[PDB]
Design an enzyme around this catalytic site. Sequence first.
Site, short mmCIF file in Angstrom:
data_model
loop_
_atom_site.label_atom_id
_atom_site.label_comp_id
_atom_site.label_asym_id
_atom_site.label_seq_id
_atom_site.Cartn_x
_atom_site.Cartn_y
_atom_site.Cartn_z
N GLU C 26 0.82 -1.20 0.00
CA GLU C 26 0.00 0.00 0.00
C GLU C 26 0.85 1.26 0.00
O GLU C 26 1.74 1.36 0.78
CB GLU C 26 -0.90 0.02 1.23
CG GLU C 26 -1.86 1.19 1.32
CD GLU C 26 -2.87 1.04 2.44
OE1 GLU C 26 -2.92 1.87 3.25
OE2 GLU C 26 -3.55 0.06 2.47
N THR C 57 -3.84 4.79 -1.42
CA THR C 57 -4.88 5.36 -0.58
C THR C 57 -5.48 6.65 -1.13
O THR C 57 -4.94 7.30 -2.03
CB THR C 57 -4.36 5.63 0.84
OG1 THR C 57 -3.31 6.60 0.79
CG2 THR C 57 -3.82 4.34 1.46
N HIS C 148 -13.63 -1.96 14.89
CA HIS C 148 -13.64 -0.56 14.46
C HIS C 148 -14.10 0.29 15.63
O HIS C 148 -15.02 -0.10 16.35
CB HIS C 148 -14.56 -0.37 13.25
CG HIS C 148 -14.54 1.02 12.68
ND1 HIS C 148 -15.38 2.02 13.12
CD2 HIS C 148 -13.77 1.57 11.72
CE1 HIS C 148 -15.13 3.13 12.45
NE2 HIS C 148 -14.15 2.88 11.59
C1 LIG Z 1 -6.74 -1.92 4.61
C2 LIG Z 1 -7.39 -0.59 4.92
C3 LIG Z 1 -7.23 0.49 3.89
C4 LIG Z 1 -7.85 1.83 4.18
N1 LIG Z 1 -7.69 2.87 3.19
C5 LIG Z 1 -8.31 4.11 3.51
C6 LIG Z 1 -8.21 5.17 2.53
O1 LIG Z 1 -7.51 4.93 1.43
N2 LIG Z 1 -8.83 6.39 2.83
C7 LIG Z 1 -9.56 6.63 4.04
O2 LIG Z 1 -10.15 7.81 4.26
N3 LIG Z 1 -9.69 5.56 5.02
C8 LIG Z 1 -9.07 4.35 4.74
N4 LIG Z 1 -9.21 3.35 5.73
C9 LIG Z 1 -9.94 3.67 6.92
C10 LIG Z 1 -11.44 3.65 6.82
O3 LIG Z 1 -11.86 4.32 5.96
C11 LIG Z 1 -11.95 3.93 8.24
O4 LIG Z 1 -11.53 2.97 9.15
C12 LIG Z 1 -13.45 4.22 8.36
O5 LIG Z 1 -13.73 4.73 9.60
C13 LIG Z 1 -14.29 2.98 8.14
O6 LIG Z 1 -14.12 2.48 6.90
P1 LIG Z 1 -14.77 1.08 6.48
O7 LIG Z 1 -14.59 0.83 4.94
O8 LIG Z 1 -14.22 0.08 7.27
O9 LIG Z 1 -16.33 1.26 6.88
P2 LIG Z 1 -17.44 0.21 7.29
O10 LIG Z 1 -17.20 -1.09 6.93
O11 LIG Z 1 -18.76 0.82 6.67
O12 LIG Z 1 -17.49 0.31 8.87
C14 LIG Z 1 -17.37 1.51 9.51
C15 LIG Z 1 -18.14 1.52 10.85
O13 LIG Z 1 -19.57 1.48 10.57
C16 LIG Z 1 -20.16 0.41 11.30
N5 LIG Z 1 -21.23 0.06 10.47
C17 LIG Z 1 -21.22 -0.65 9.21
N6 LIG Z 1 -22.56 -0.72 8.71
C18 LIG Z 1 -23.36 -0.05 9.69
C19 LIG Z 1 -24.82 0.22 9.72
N7 LIG Z 1 -25.66 -0.25 8.67
N8 LIG Z 1 -25.31 0.93 10.85
C20 LIG Z 1 -24.45 1.42 11.96
N9 LIG Z 1 -23.01 1.17 11.92
C21 LIG Z 1 -22.53 0.45 10.77
C22 LIG Z 1 -19.06 -0.64 11.29
O14 LIG Z 1 -19.30 -1.58 12.28
C23 LIG Z 1 -17.90 0.23 11.63
O15 LIG Z 1 -17.90 0.57 12.94
C24 LIG Z 1 -8.62 2.08 5.47
C25 LIG Z 1 -8.79 0.99 6.51
C26 LIG Z 1 -8.16 -0.33 6.21
C27 LIG Z 1 -8.28 -1.43 7.24
#
Ligand SMILES: Cc1cc2nc3c(=O)[nH]c(=O)nc-3n(C[C@H](O)[C@H](O)[C@H](O)COP(=O)(O)OP(=O)(O)OC[C@H]3O[C@@H](n4cnc5c(N)ncnc54)[C@H](O)[C@@H]3O)c2cc1C
EC number: 1.5.1.54
Lengths: 265, 274, 286, 286
Positions: C26, C57, C148
Amino acid sequence: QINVSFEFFPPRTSEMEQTLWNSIDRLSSLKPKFVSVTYGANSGERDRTHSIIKGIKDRTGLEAAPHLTCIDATPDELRTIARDYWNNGIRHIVALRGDEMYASDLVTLLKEVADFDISVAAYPEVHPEAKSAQADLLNLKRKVDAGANRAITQFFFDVESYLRFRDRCVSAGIDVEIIPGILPVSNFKQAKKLADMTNVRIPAWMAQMFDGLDDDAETRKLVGANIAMDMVKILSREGVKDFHFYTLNRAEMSYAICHTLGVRP
Amino acid sequence: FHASQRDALNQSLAEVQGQINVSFEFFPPRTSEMEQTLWNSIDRLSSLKPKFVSVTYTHSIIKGIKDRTGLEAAPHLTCIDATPDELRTIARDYWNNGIRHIVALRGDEMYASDLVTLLKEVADFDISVAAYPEVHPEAKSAQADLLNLKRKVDAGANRAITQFFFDVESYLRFRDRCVSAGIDVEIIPGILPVSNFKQAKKLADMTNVRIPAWMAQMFDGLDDDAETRKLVGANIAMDMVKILSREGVKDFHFYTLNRAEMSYAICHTLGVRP
Amino acid sequence: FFHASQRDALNQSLAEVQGQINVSFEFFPPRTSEMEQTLWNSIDRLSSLKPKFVSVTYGANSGERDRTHSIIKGIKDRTGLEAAPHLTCIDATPDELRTIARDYWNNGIRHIVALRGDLPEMYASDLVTLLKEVADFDISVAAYPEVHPEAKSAQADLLNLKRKVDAGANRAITQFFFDVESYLRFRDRCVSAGIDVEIIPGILPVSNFKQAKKLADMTNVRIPAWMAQMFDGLDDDAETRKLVGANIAMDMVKILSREGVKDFHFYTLNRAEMSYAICHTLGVRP
Amino acid sequence: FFHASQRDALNQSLAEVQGQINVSFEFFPPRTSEMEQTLWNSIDRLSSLKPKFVSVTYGANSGERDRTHSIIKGIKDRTGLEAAPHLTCIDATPDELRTIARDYWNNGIRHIVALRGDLPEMYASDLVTLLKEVADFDISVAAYPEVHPEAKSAQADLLNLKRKVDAGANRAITQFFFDVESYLRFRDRCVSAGIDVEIIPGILPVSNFKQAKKLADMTNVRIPAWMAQMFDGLDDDAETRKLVGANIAMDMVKILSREGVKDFHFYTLNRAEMSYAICHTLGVRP
Ligand SMILES: Cc1cc2nc3c(=O)[nH]c(=O)nc-3n(C[C@H](O)[C@H](O)[C@H](O)COP(=O)(O)OP(=O)(O)OC[C@H]3O[C@@H](n4cnc5c(N)ncnc54)[C@H](O)[C@@H]3O)c2cc1C
Ligand SMILES: Cc1cc2nc3c(=O)[nH]c(=O)nc-3n(C[C@H](O)[C@H](O)[C@H](O)COP(=O)(O)OP(=O)(O)OC[C@H]3O[C@@H](n4cnc5c(N)ncnc54)[C@H](O)[C@@H]3O)c2cc1C
Ligand SMILES: Cc1cc2nc3c(=O)[nH]c(=O)nc-3n(C[C@H](O)[C@H](O)[C@H](O)COP(=O)(O)OP(=O)(O)OC[C@H]3O[C@@H](n4cnc5c(N)ncnc54)[C@H](O)[C@@H]3O)c2cc1C
Ligand SMILES: Cc1cc2nc3c(=O)[nH]c(=O)nc-3n(C[C@H](O)[C@H](O)[C@H](O)COP(=O)(O)OP(=O)(O)OC[C@H]3O[C@@H](n4cnc5c(N)ncnc54)[C@H](O)[C@@H]3O)c2cc1C
Ligand SMILES: OC[C@@H](O)[C@@H](O)CO
C-alpha cells in the site's frame, strides 16, 4: 485405546491382485475398525471397487467401506447404487466428490437413502481448488452438518499442519473425529508425485532423507518406517486415537507401524 | 512442543551430513554361507568410507579387508589366550604388515590395561579399549570399573568403545562421569541394531546390559515375524543415533554381526552415504 | 531446551515457505517532490518482488482524488502491475461514485479497495453493492481484528464484515495490529460467522514509534507493553528504531506464516527498505 | 496458539531484564585511518552503555603487539573503562611474556584475555599460570561450544577449559555460534566437568555473511541451513543483510536471556550499530 483403518485400491493386474489378498489377510488380524477401497473412474470403475469390498466382507467379516464419488453420476443413479449397497450389508461409505454436486450434496443424498455411517475427506493443507482455507474449513463443516460422522485427512508430512488443522476444526465447532490419514513411504519418487498433486508439503529434512536412495528399496523401507513410526508416536502423544493407513495394497509397513502403536493380533 | 522438537531434531540430523565418523565391527565367519555374507557386507559398507573397521578375536580377514578395500582394519587382540611373550610376537607381527590400529581387550593374569602398556612398549599403535556404561559384570563397583577405563586410557588408549546399550540416558550419564574423572578420550557408542530380539536378549544378559521395559514390549509378540522385527529394530536404532548426534556424539561403532542392511540404513540417516 | 528448539523449527519452516507467499503493498499519494522521488524509488524496488497487487490510498474528505488516480496510472504504466485505488463513499454521491467507478473500469482498473472513510449516509457495504452493479470488480474491504472504533459491538462489526463480503467483496484486509493473538482469534471468529474469504493481515513495519503510536491510538490498536518498552529511549535514534522494528515485524510474519497465513499486505508508508527485508524473510525475493 | 503465546512471554521476559545484563565489547586494532575513525566513533557510542569491560585483540604471529597496547591505553584515557588486551603465547617466550605482563600491570591494566593463538610449545593454560605468577590478574579464556578445531576430542577440549580455569582463569568467553542449543548443551557439560565459572556467550552480529561464513568455516562453527537461506541472494544488499542479521542476533540473545544468561560479549568488528541495538533489546541503554 487406538483404532485403525486401512485403505486399499482395486488391483489392475493379476500380480497386484495376489498382493492385495495377502495384505488383507495380514492386516485383518489387527481387527481394524473398518477398511476402505478407493474408486478410480478410469482405473477400474465402481464395479471393481464393489467387487473388492464384497470380497473383503466375505473373506474377513470386516466392515468394508467403498469410496463413492459423484462425478459423472446422476442423483438417481447414486440413490439406486446406495440402496443396493445398503441392502447388501454395506453400511459405511466414504462419500467424495471425486478426482455439479459437491461432496456435501452426496452426504445428504446418502442419508436420505439410509442411515449410513459416512466418512468424508478433510485437507489440513487446503484442497487445491478451494478459494480459501476459510472456505475449505466451512465446507468440511457443511459435510459434517449434512451427516458425516468422521473426517479422514489427506496425508501430510508436516505433523504440525495436522495439529493446527485439528485445532481449527474444533474452533469451528466440528465435533467429529478428524482422523489422520497416514502414508508410509517406501517409494519416495511416487510419494513426491502424489504430494505435489495434492499440495502436501514435504519437509526439507524428509527430501534429504530419501536423497540417493532411488535404487535402494531396502534402505527406503527402513527410513520410511522410521518416519511413519515417529509421526504416529507424536500424534498419539497429542491425543490422536484413530489412524487411517494408505497402504497402497502393501501390508508390511502399516502392520509394523500398528505394532508400535500397540495394535497387535 | 513434541512436534516442533522432532522437526528440529530431524533437521539438525539432516545438517550433520558429512561430519559423522563411523566404524564397523565384523566377526570371523564359521561357515561358507557366512563367509559370502561377510564379504558382501564388507563391499557394501566400505562404500561408506568408515574411519576404520575391526574384526573380533582374524589376521587373515584383516589382511583380506586391507587389500580388498584399502580401509584401516583394526584387529581385536585379547590376552586371555596367550602369554606376555607371545603377544609381543603377535603384535610385532601386525605392525610389520601395516596394522597400526588394535582393539586391546582382556578377552571373554594380565588385564587390558596391561595389554595397552605392552603394545605401546612395542610400537606407537592406535589403541582402542572397551568401556561399560552399565558396568562390566566382574567389576566390584561402577567407580572401580570407571577408574579402570581411566587406567587403560592413561596407559595409552586413545579411543574407548562402549558395550552396546539400549538406555540412552545410561550412556549419557556415563559419558559425563568419564569427563569428571579426567578421561580425555571420546566414549564412542557401540550400536547394536536389533533384528533378532531373542538373540539380543541373550547377549545382553551375558554382558549386564539392561533391556528397558519399553523395548521388551516393543518386541513382544514378534518371535516369528522377522519383517516387523527389522522395521522395529531399525526404528529404535535410528532414534538412538538421532538423540546421540544432537548430544554432540560424532562417532559411532556398529556391531554389524556381519550384516550390512541395518547399519547401512542407520548410517544413511546420519548422512553417511556413498 | 524448548525455547531454542521452537526457534529452530519456526525458522526452518519459514525457510521452506519460499515461493508460496503472496504479498501486496500500500502506498499513499506523495505531497512533496521529495516524497514523490521516494515513492517511485520504492515502487521500483518493491515491484521486483512481483506483488499480487499494489494499492494507493485516498484521504476521505480531502478533495484530492485526482492525485490518487494519477499515481495509479503511473504505477500501471511504469510497472505493469495491478494497481488498486482506494475509494471512499463518505464524501461522494452514488452518482459521482458510479461515474468514478466506470472511468476506472474503462481505464483498465478492475480492483478497488472499497471503504467508507472517516466521518468528515453510505456505509462501505453500500459502496460494495454499488461497485458490483457497475462492473465485476475485484473488491477488497477493511477488517478490524480489534473492532472498528465506532462499532456498537464486536458482533456488529463482524456481521458488518460479513455484509461486505456477501455484497461482493472478495478480499478482506486487516487494520494493522501488534498483538498477533488478536489476529488469530479474529480469523477464527470470521469462520464462526461463516465468512469464506481469506483474512489478509495488514502489516505496519515500525520505524517511527511516535508516529505509529499516534496511528494506533486513533484506531483502537493495542501496543503491547513489551513493544512500548522496546521503543523507549529511541526518540532520537532512527538507526536502532529501524533494527528493532524490523525484528518485531519479522517475528510477527514468521508466526503468522506458521499458522498458515500465505498473504500479507504491507503498509509501506512509501518506504521500501523494511517491507522489502520482511518479504525477503518470507522467501519473497527478486 | 502456542507460537504466538510463547513469543509474547519471551518478549515480556526480555523487557523485565532491564538493569540485570552485563555486556562487554571486543575491538581490533584499526589498520587504516578510516578504520581508526570508525573505531573511536564506536568506542564513544558503546562506552555510553557502561560495559563491564572492553577488549582489544592481538593477531598471533603478526609482530604488531604495539598497536594493541596503543589502542588499549587510548580507550582507558578516553573512557575510563576497564580495557583488556588479548595476549597470545604462541609467538613469545615466557620471559618476554612476563615482561609484557609486568608492564601491563604497572600501567593499570589488570584484566588480560589469555590465549594461545593459532600456530604460525606453550598452551593457553601455561600462559594463565605464567600470568598469575606475575600478579593477581583478572584472566579471561576462550571456550568452544563446538570444540576447538585441533582438539583430539570434545572431552579433551572440555578438560582443557577446566585446566585453564583451575590455573586461574575467572571468565570463559565462547567462540561465536549460531546454533543456540550447542551453547546451552555446552554450558551443561561444563557443569558436569565441575567448571564453576560462568560461560559467557560471544555473540557475532552478522552484517556481512560472506565474511561470517569464512570465519565460521575456519573455526568449525556451524551455520544452520535456515541461516544460509536467510542470507541467500543478499550479496549486494547491505541494507537487507543488516536487518536480517539484527533479527537473528536479537532472537539469539532473547533466548539466551530466558535461559538465564546475564553476560554477553560482542564481537563488534569495530562497528557499533548492531551491537548497540542488540544491547538495547536486552535493556542495556544509556
Ligand atoms: C486496509 C485498509 C485500507 C484503508 N484505506 C483508507 C483510505 O484509502 N482512505 C480513508 O479515508 N480511510 C481508509 N481506511 C480507513 C477507513 O476508511 C476507516 O476505518 C473508516 O472509519 C471505516 O471504513 P470502512 O470501509 O471500514 O467502513 P465500514 O465497513 O462501513 O465500517 C465503519 C463503521 O460502521 C459500522 N457500520 C457498518 N454498517 C453499519 C450500519 N448499517 N449501521 C451502523 N453502523 C454500521 C461498522 O461496524 C464500523 O464501525 C482504510 C482501513 C483499512 C483497514
Ligand atoms: C481420505 C480421502 C479418500 C479419497 N478417496 C478417493 C477415491 O477413492 N476416488 C477419487 O476419485 N478421489 C478420492 N479422493 C479425493 C477427492 O476426490 C478429491 O480431493 C476431490 O477433488 C474432492 O473431493 P471431496 O469429497 O473432498 O470434495 P469436496 O468436499 O466437495 O471439496 C472439493 C472442493 O470444492 C470446494 N467446495 C465445496 N463446496 C463448494 C461450493 N458450494 N462452492 C465452491 N467450492 C466448493 C472445496 O472447498 C474443495 O476445494 C479422496 C480424498 C481423501 C482425503
Ligand atoms: C567394543 C568391544 C569389543 C570387544 N571385542 C572382543 C573380542 O574381539 N574378543 C573377545 O574375546 N572379547 C571381546 N570383548 C569383550 C571383552 O573382552 C570382555 O568384556 C572381557 O570381559 C573384558 O575385557 P576388557 O578389555 O574390558 O578388560 P579390562 O579392561 O582389563 O577390564 C575387565 C574387568 O577387570 C576389572 N579390572 C581391570 N583391571 C583390574 C585391576 N587392576 N584390579 C581389579 N579388577 C580389575 C575391570 O573393572 C573389569 O571388570 C569386547 C568388548 C567391547 C566393549
Ligand atoms: C573470545 C576469544 C578471543 C580470541 N582473541 C584472539 C586474539 O586476540 N588473537 C589470536 O591470535 N587468537 C584469538 N583467539 C583465537 C585463539 O587464539 C585460537 O582459537 C587458538 O587456536 C587457540 O587459542 P586458545 O587460547 O583457545 O588455546 P588453548 O586453550 O591452549 O587450546 C588450543 C588447542 O590446544 C588443545 N590443547 C590444550 N592443551 C593441550 C595439551 N596440553 N596437549 C595437546 N592439545 C592441547 C586444546 O584442546 C585446543 O584444541 C580468540 C578466541 C576466542 C574464543
Ligand atoms: O486421500 C488420498 C489417498 O487416497 C492417497 O494417499 C491414495 O494412496
